[PDB]
Automatic annotation (TrEMBL), chain B:
RNA-dependent RNA polymerase that catalyzes the extension of a non-coding RNA (ncRNA) at the 3'-end using the four ribonucleoside triphosphates as substrates. An internal ncRNA sequence near the 3'-end serves as a template in a single-round Pol II-mediated RNA polymerization reaction. May decrease the stability of ncRNAs that repress Pol II-mediated gene transcription. It comes from Sus scrofa (Pig). It is found in: Chromosome; Cytoplasm; Nucleus. Belongs to the RNA polymerase beta' chain family. This is DNA-directed RNA polymerase subunit. The chain holds residues 1792 to 1804 of 1968 of the full protein. The gene is POLR2A.
Amino acid sequence: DNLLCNLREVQCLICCLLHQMYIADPNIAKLVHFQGYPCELLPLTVAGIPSMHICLDFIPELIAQPELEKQIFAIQLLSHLCIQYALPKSLSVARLAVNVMGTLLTVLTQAKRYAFFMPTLPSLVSFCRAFPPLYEDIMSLLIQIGQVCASDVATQTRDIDPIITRLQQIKEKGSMDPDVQLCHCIERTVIEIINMSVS
Amino acid sequence: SPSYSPTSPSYSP
Amino acid sequence: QSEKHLEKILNVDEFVKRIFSVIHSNDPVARAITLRMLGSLASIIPERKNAHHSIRQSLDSHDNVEVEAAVFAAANFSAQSKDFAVG
Amino acid sequence: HLALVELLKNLTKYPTDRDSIWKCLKFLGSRHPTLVLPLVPELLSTHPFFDTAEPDMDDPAYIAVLVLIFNAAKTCPTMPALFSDHTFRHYAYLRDSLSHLVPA
Amino acid sequence: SSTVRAVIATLRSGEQCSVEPDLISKVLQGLIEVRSPHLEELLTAFFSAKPVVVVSSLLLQRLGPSSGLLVDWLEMLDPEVVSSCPDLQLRLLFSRPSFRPYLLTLFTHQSSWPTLHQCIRVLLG
């Protein structure tokens, strides 16, 4: 049941070993996070390994990597690190990541925009949760991404046409178009941001 | 340092 | 191995402070080793309240080596201090 | 707040009087509880969102602040949730060490 | 004393026989009530060659000073805490005993996760 299972104890033992190994060599932690691991492990690694706060040192270096997967993983890792550690330098790296996403909005093509912004959009909810000063930057970025992604929805004919559904209520929490999926992801992320900030 | 939390008390020599 | 010679150092405060600084380490092994240091030094720092608080806090930790070291430190400090023993 | 600032700079200028100054702050917190309550985020350096560094224990200015705060929190249970985690740990430490000053 | 010495010799030499667990429970209860010094030997010889039911029924029933030996056996002959005849073990653990917190401390840390989950399901629902 994700808490009273053998998998939880195995995860704790592995997290303890990784904590010891990262203390013994932080360069191993830097190399592993440059290689990357599945993002399902990210909350487990951030919560269970206390020496994960040193990842904020090379997240500015990791987010500058040419490969898109490295930048996606850097943003997703900083997402959990800002929740775990709300540092002033964590805020600086969060501002850097917001600027990187704003720049990659205007650098990447439409397929690359989908493949980059679908995983990294839930990171903005955690960025807003850790740093309430980031509300203006996150909301301006979300307006920009949504207005960019509505335009190529209008470019091609669509099977569901989300422009008409601009007046929709709060919905409950497969072969759809990538642009419409990205529009729904933007709407979902602003829904979670507003729900988090209201609570 | 990886061995200390960022919120841990600092050591002043 | 040098328990009889550590009663003649007389710069107790800064020595114990620079050992005690790595009770705040996130490593449970380092915390356990420091608890064993405090229990080893309990002859020359009785009624040292931050050591008592560290033993009390580490007795409730989730790491087995840290709890065992806290038990060892509590056994040493209870022998050398009655104010530690009563709580 | 002015009384606390003057007591703290007296503590800096004369560290021998720390027990008397702690008694002063115990009596000030215990008898002026509602007035200390809005002052708490100004005394404990509690950022609204940043995770604050744990203050150095056994630093006589910081115990003096905590003795004032905890004695104010004894008679007013309205806002004891303004404490952070390390302030609760320090509350346990002062209850173990300075139990004649800090109350339950 | 003579009969328990004879039974100890018989179990040491010979193999098992018609057990009749009610008779074994009655004999162990009688030896507990008379406080025989050969009780540990008799339990060792009986359980060397369903003992879970016997020990659980003995503990569920005064035991006095002999309860610790039965608790040690229940810990040792039953490999888990609630694995065989679970109704008696739930009656031992949760019911309306002085040795109960020790059995709870065992069951929290000795039993497996499916057993703990089944226990909380039957305890709540």
